[PDB]
Amino acid sequence: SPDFAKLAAAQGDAIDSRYHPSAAVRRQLNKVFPTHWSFLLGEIALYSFIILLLTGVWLTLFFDPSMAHVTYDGVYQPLRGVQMSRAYETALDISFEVRGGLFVRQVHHWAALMFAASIMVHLARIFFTGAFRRPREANWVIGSLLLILAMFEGFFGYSLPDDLLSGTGIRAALSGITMGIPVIGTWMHWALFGGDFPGEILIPRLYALHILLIPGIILALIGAHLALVWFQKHTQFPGPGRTETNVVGVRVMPVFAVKSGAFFAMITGVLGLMGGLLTINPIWNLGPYKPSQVSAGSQPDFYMMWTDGLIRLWPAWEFYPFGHTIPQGVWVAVGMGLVFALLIAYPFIEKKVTGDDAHHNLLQRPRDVPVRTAIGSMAIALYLLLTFACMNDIIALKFHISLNATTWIGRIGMVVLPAIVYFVAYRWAISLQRSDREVLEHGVETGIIKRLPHGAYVELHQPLGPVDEHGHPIPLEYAGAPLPKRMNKLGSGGAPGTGSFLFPDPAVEHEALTEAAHASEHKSLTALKEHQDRIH
């Protein structure tokens, strides 16, 4: 007969006698992580990384990576008797001749986008909140290599089906950019293709880099990345009990094993819907890659789009120093390493210009940092311009503007728009700071007016603190914590009366529940307050 109580202790004693992980399990089962929604943005890039491993292993044992020419002779009727590579036939066999093969193929492209998108969202949490300053410098650098690898790991991914849209990206990037390099540019092209483009060995080299090497590096950097956040006691925002040497949050065993394991079920659930409902890469529409045809356009996925727009906007500037030449494509290869050098080495740029070499464990609220908020949104608005200038064959056609006017709003705007987003965000950030000081000095602006008996429309502020014998409140001190601006958020709304959405509870069971809501939101409030006074 099953028991699951005596068996749970007799097996736990067998682990704790052969091994002894109880003095080490408890120290990582009482680990405290801060509950904040921004601190789950890095988990979206991790939970999409696992789906790319799981859905990748599936179609690894169906895909054939060669470039050998073979006629189709299969099931897709427009592609019959067509000279195609073998990498494009076994990508049309996953989509069409395997049960549930197009689904796993589509989830794997959408998870590749959610991987690269939730890196960029997660970089924007780290940069603006200042989560990189003193101990986390190496975790930025070990971090920011995962962005540079995810650019190239995805770019080596859709190059594998050898599509007509996808093959002209290899001719542009890996054969046009890497052939105009001035020191050696032609020697690097033969060391990558085994000869002139296309060759025969490219897609097998782009298969081993994409399955073994670069996910072997990304998974090894992530293990070095999550160790430096497990063993460096994850940063927190300032607040009531948060005092620069504590971690005020929730533990690992009852909570954060649940809310981080259920969040993995939902991020897999969103990609299950998007990989099922929304078609992603219909590689059967555009034919096989042959160097004598093109499509209506050519553009990468959205993570590699800022490099394509960087090609389109720099004008035809070449030098010709001697009997050699220096083409336009080297301005991107030196303009891609310069962007990557400033993004890897940023925590060492900011401490050189500020002298901020003290140990930081409380996050900066990004309105309190008006320059780095403005330098950041300068760099979003330059990314958002370079990623919209690579799709100006679609802005010209669908939005009806021009094909010549979209480059000149991308050329004039590349200087202007990062310069007028620096101004408006240095002045947005300080103007949020003054909004936090009109709520400390005066109080929360309640809406209710109350005309006085002599005229005198007033506003009836709620002071958020002690009061004077005169009607003015004492001014509080700012402490980096977010201040409430609305009175419903201070619990002045109330409870709608318990019951279902249609039928009420008998109101004896209402007063017993709402009393436990003002005695658990008040026992919690006198718990942080008696701990804040214990520290200071």
């Binding site: 789950l40 979206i44 939730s118 925002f237 969040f263 929304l278 992603i280 219909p282 996925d301 679609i394």
Partner: peptide, 30 residues
């Protein structure tokens, strides 16, 4: 109607709104 430009729009306003909007429901605001 296809290509990687509607992939990018349907990622940020569908996939990452429903990934941030879930994270804002699970996590707290402090």
């Amino acid at each position: 109607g296809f290509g990687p430009a509607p992939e990018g729009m349907a990622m940020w306003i569908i996939g990452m709104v429903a990934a941030i909007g879930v994270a804002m429901w699970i996590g707290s605001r402090a």
